[PDB]
Amino acid sequence: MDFDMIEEKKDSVIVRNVENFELKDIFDCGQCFRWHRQENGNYIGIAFEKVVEVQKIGEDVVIYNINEEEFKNVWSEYFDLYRDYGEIKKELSRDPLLKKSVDFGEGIRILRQDPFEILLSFIISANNRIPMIKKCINNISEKAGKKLEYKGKIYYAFPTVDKLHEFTEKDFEECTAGFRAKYLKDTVDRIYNGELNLEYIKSLNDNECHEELKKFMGVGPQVADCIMLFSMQKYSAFPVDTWVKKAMMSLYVAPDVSLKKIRDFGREKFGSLSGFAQQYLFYYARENNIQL
Ligand SMILES: Nc1nc2c([nH]c(=O)n2[C@H]2C[C@H](O)[C@@H](CO)O2)c(=O)[nH]1
């Protein structure tokens, strides 16, 4: 594990000697939308119908609003704290071309998020901008999510499948999903009616899992890779957007080809570490706003 032990406190849990764990790297590397940076450096987020605040002090991490039982069954896995990222980075850094990206995002960890929330979140992410995506997801939660309180503030859990089934295309449109409102509604019904089952989809191997997810309206190859990587731990995924495409052409002189071919080229080169590889690539590419 990438931590030595924990210690339960009054209203929190302290993780001792965490390794490969930085707040900005984890929360701003592109994998999540409901974690917000606070004035003091901490981050507050809403996941699994719960509000959590995370802080790093030295080599320790404090997770407020949770107990040891919650840490053991929910959060330790949420933060993928059982996987050794030192090995991942060591293996990838063998490629001198990846070192710079890996070192820049050294504290990245791929969270184990909820499939349903992730499915709708990334359908919303397609050709969108960060602000609109976050706004839309929050709007959907405020409108139909369980109300929550933390330190004098109200927050909204992500809505259940049943509550969202009540939504009309117009509702998603009012939350500003734009033309994607149609995809959200179509997708929620497929979930509700039982046509597509997320937990079953998640039990399939990387390639099968991927194919199924593409059955959802608004879900193409890129979005499918994001969904299975971020919520179904299918590590051979290699999400290709314009940022990953740039970093890829720039480093391996890959010629301008389809996203599918860039995806095939990435997965071929990184295998089981493809997902981790693209996150480092993506994070570095976007924060440094690289060009041809
Ligand atoms: N390849 C890739 N693309 C992503 C991720 N997260 C994310 O939002 N995107 C896309 C969505 C949208 O196309 C743009 C938003 O910055 O980047 C992500 O984690 N990986």
Lookup result for tokens 């590889």: 277
Q: Where are the domains of the chain?
A: 1-113, 114-234, 235-292
Amino acid at 52: V
Residue 22 · residue 107 · CB < 8 Å: yes
Distance CA 239, CA 126 (A): 12
CB of 244 shorter than 6 A to ligand 1:
yes
CB of 30 shorter than 6 A to ligand 1:
yes
Kindly give the distance from the C-alpha atom of residue 86 to the centroid of ligand 1, in angstroms, as a whole number: 24
Which of 107, 114, 60 has the alpha carbon at shortest distance from 88?
107
The burial class, CB within 10 Å (0-12 / 13-18 / 19+), for 114 is: middle
Which of 220, 164, 173 has the alpha carbon at shortest distance from 192?
164
Topology at the third CATH level for domain 1-113: TATA-Binding Protein (3.30.310)
Which of 28, 25, 283, 277 has the alpha carbon at shortest distance from 130?
28
> CA distances (Å), 39 to each of 28, 48, 107, in order?
16, 24, 20
Q: Could you tell which of 119, 235, 282, 287 is best to mutate to test the pocket of ligand 1, judged by most ligand atoms within 8 Å of the CB?
A: 282
Atom 20, ligand 1: residue with shortest CA distance: 239
Domain 114-234 has CATH 1.10.275.10: no
Kindly give the distance from the C-alpha atom of residue 122 to the centroid of ligand 1, in angstroms, as a whole number: 8
Atom 13, ligand 1: residue with shortest CA distance: 127
Atom 11, ligand 1: residue with shortest CA distance: 125
Amino acid at 143: K
Helix pair angle (259-270, 242-252), 10° resolution: 60
Lookup result for tokens 């330790």: 76
Q: Could you tell which of 226, 278, 284 is best to mutate to test the pocket of ligand 1, judged by most ligand atoms within 8 Å of the CB?
A: 226
Hey, which residues does 45 pair with through a beta bridge?
35, 52
Distance CA 172, CA 120 (A): 11
Atom of ligand 1 nearest to the CA of 127: 13
What is the SS3 assignment for the chain? CCCCCEEEECCEEEECCCCCCCHHHHHHCCCCCCEEECCCCCEEEECCCCEEEEEEECCEEEEECCCHHHHHHHHHHHCCCCCCHHHHHHHHCCCHHHHHHHHHCCCCCCCCCCHHHHHHHHHHHCCCCHHHHHHHHHHHHHHHCCEEEECCEEEECCCCHHHHHCCCHHHHHHCCCHHHHHHHHHHHHHHHCCCCCHHHHHHCCHHHHHHHHCCCCCCCHHHHHHHHHHHHCCCCCCCCCHHHHHHHHHHHCCCCCCHHHHHHHHHHHHHHHHHHHHHHHHHHHHHCCCCC
Atom 17, ligand 1: residue with shortest CA distance: 241
Which of 186, 285, 272 has the alpha carbon at shortest distance from 229?
272
Atom 8, ligand 1: residue with shortest CA distance: 30
Distance CA 227, CA 256 (A): 25
Lookup result for tokens 């969202």: 164
Atom of ligand 1 nearest to the CA of 31: 19
Lookup result for tokens 């929050």: 138
Distance CA 125, CA 254 (A): 25
Domain 235-292 has CATH 3.40.50.10860: no
